[PDB]
Amino acid sequence: TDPTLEWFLSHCHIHKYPSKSTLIHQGEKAETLYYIVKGSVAVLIKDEEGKEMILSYLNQGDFIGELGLFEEGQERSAWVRAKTACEVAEISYKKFRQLIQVNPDILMRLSAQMARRLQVTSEKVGNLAFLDVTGRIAQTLLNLAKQPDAMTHPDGMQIKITRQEIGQIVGCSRETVGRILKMLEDQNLISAHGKTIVVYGT
Amino acid sequence: QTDPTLEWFLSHCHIHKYPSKSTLIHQGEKAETLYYIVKGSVAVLIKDEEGKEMILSYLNQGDFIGELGLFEEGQERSAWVRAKTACEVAEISYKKFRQLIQVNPDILMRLSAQMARRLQVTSEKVGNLAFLDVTGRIAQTLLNLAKQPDAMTHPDGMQIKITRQEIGQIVGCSRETVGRILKMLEDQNLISAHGKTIVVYG
Numbered sequence: 001t002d003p004t005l006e007w008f009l010s011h012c013h014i015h016k017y018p019s020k021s022t023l024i025h026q027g028e029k030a031e032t033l034y035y036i037v038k039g040s041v042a043v044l045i046k047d048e049e050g051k052e053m054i055l056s057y058l059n060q061g062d063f064i065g066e067l068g069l070f071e072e073g074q075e076r077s078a079w080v081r082a083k084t085a086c087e088v089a090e091i092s093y094k095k096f097r098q099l100i101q102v103n104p105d106i107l108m109r110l111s112a113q114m115a116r117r118l119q120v121t122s123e124k125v126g127n128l129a130f131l132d133v134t135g136r137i138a139q140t141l142l143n144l145a146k147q148p149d150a151m152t153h154p155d156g157m158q159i160k161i162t163r164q165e166i167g168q169i170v171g172c173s174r175e176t177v178g179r180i181l182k183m184l185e186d187q188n189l190i191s192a193h194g195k196t197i198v199v200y201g202t
Numbered sequence: 203q204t205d206p207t208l209e210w211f212l213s214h215c216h217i218h219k220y221p222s223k224s225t226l227i228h229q230g231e232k233a234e235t236l237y238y239i240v241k242g243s244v245a246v247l248i249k250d251e252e253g254k255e256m257i258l259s260y261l262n263q264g265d266f267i268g269e270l271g272l273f274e275e276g277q278e279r280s281a282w283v284r285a286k287t288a289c290e291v292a293e294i295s296y297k298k299f300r301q302l303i304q305v306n307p308d309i310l311m312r313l314s315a316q317m318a319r320r321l322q323v324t325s326e327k328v329g330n331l332a333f334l335d336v337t338g339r340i341a342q343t344l345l346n347l348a349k350q351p352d353a354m355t356h357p358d359g360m361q362i363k364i365t366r367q368e369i370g371q372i373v374g375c376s377r378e379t380v381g382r383i384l385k386m387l388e389d390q391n392l393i394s395a396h397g398k399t400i401v402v403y404g
């Protein structure tokens with residue numbers, strides 16, 4: 001029973017998107033705000049040749065498309081792709097600005113998300129500047145093995161993730177991931193010849 | 203410049219002076235206060251595990267600082283903020299600012315516009331660190347420095363004043379590596395250097 005949210009949503013139009021669909025294309029002019037009613041999405045950027053990196057996952061209760069709201073004529077800063085089937089609310093910036101005047105609390109909620117995103121994204125900068133691709137992948141595997149969904153393994157922790165997915169986390173090709181996983185395995189730090197990846201130590 | 207809404211806000215603030223190099227905000231402090239730069243500029247810094255500093259952003263006259271803890275009590279400052287020139291900085295408790303928002307939400311709109319711009323800029327830096335080689339990282343850094351308020355017009359582009367150390371802290375390289383790359387960009391006729399002065403070609 002969140003009256004402000006239900007009220008906000010009643011001014012949106014809501015649509016279903018299947019997994020893998022693209023909600024937002026980078027470079028499109030930004031005139032509308034989104035809100036995830038159900039599902040999860042990936043926010044992605046690309047280099048000149050199409051190599052992808054994930055800036056963030058966003059989930060139920062997250063706003064999307066907010067970055068052009070405060071100045072007209074801006075473009076979308078990233079792609080947003082559905083990672084699961086999603087239900088996503090959309091509203092024009094013009095209408096949302098009307099809602100803000102009615103109850104500023106809806107803006108407070110959006111701004112709280114933007115603040116968190118800046119904190120999380122700033123933490124990434126430190127890592128990318130200081131580590132090379134091997135160090136980025138190594139750090140990523142340790143980070144994944146410390147998440148709640150990591151599984152225990154007699155030898156440490158076990159994670160399930162594709163070379164493609166790791167590549168999207170660090171901004172490199174699935175091939176480069178493959179080469180580096182083999183090197184870490186030869187350094188006795190992980191086992192990947194299995195199905196999942198085992199990260200040695202807890 | 204200024205308007206009555208900013209002056210209204212400022213009349214609720216205490217204004218304090220900070221000499222160059224003095225630290226306004228230390229990482230880890232309890233966040234309870236919002237700042238606004240009335241005059242001067244600052245650097246926002248974070249550190250690597252080894253304690254080496256990185257420059258995350260510059261901020262200038264008209265920028266809010268210390269905003270990231272406003273939306274949820276109990277948070278810590280996410281970075282250090284240090285005066286780059288002599289500074290005059292307005293300050294107000296989060297509690298009093300949240301009262302002002304309820305009186306006139308436009309002051310929150312102004313803060314949120316800067317948070318959105320910061321997320322765009324920091325996300326672009328994440329892509330640059332992830333994707334570009336060290337040479338390209340530095341070349342893009344010089345282009346970005348040329349957009350700062352203190353950069354000066356020049357026949358062939360913009361003129362900036364910056365040290366090997368500062369560039370290194372922005373891209374995460376040694377002063378040695380920066381020097382070597384600057385010499386290359388100069389040979390590639392992308393810039394011209396003179397002591398600590400650099401002309402960045404358009």
Ligand SMILES: Nc1ncnc2c1ncn2[C@@H]1O[C@@H]2COP(=O)(O)O[C@H]2[C@H]1O
Pocket residue numbers: 024030043055056063064065066067068075076077078079080117121321325
């Ligand atoms: N670093 C980030 N963290 C979380 N989401 C982001 C980040 N960068 C971009 N986005 C989201 O991706 C959206 C792309 O379109 P917009 O720029 O309009 O709004 C953007 C944000 O909703």
Ligand SMILES: Nc1ncnc2c1ncn2[C@@H]1O[C@@H]2COP(=O)(O)O[C@H]2[C@H]1O
Pocket residue numbers: 118122227233246258259266267268269270271278279280281282283320324
């Ligand atoms: N990525 C960033 N870009 C611009 N300013 C930042 C960035 N990260 C942190 N800051 C600023 O540094 C301040 C540190 O204190 P706060 O976390 O309260 O608020 C932070 C922001 O004002």
